[PDB]
Amino acid sequence: GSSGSSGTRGGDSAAAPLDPPKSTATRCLSCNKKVGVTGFKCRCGSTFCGTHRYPESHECQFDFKGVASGPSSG
């Protein structure tokens, strides 16, 4: 057996999916990868990694400037 503990309190959390107070973290929205701070915020608010930071890579839910087209992957 071993001893140890880790926890944070406050209003740091910037983006996170609908989850209970049991635990909260920051990960990508497509690869659910630990992005923490390095994460790249998007117009939709969500947080992605340096791989899915761009919109074209991740179907941005937030309607860009309202107008919508929906680019299909040939």
Q: Is 60 annotated as a binding residue?
A: yes
Contact predicate 26/34, CB 8 Å: yes
Q: Which is nearer to Zn ion, 22 or 65 (CB)?
A: 65
- Indicate whether 27 belongs to the interface with Zn ion (CB under 5 A): no
3-state secondary structure (DSSP) of residue 9: coil
- Indicate whether 49 belongs to the interface with Zn ion (CB under 5 A): yes
Q: What is d(CA 31, CA 7) in angstroms, rounded to the nearest whole number? A: 24
- Indicate whether 15 belongs to the interface with Zn ion (CB under 5 A): no
Interface residue with Zn ion, options 31, 40, 65, 69 (CB under 5 A): 31
Q: Which is nearer to Zn ion, 1 or 66 (CB)?
A: 66
Q: Is 36 annotated as a binding residue?
A: no
| CA triple 11-60-64, angle to 5 deg | 100
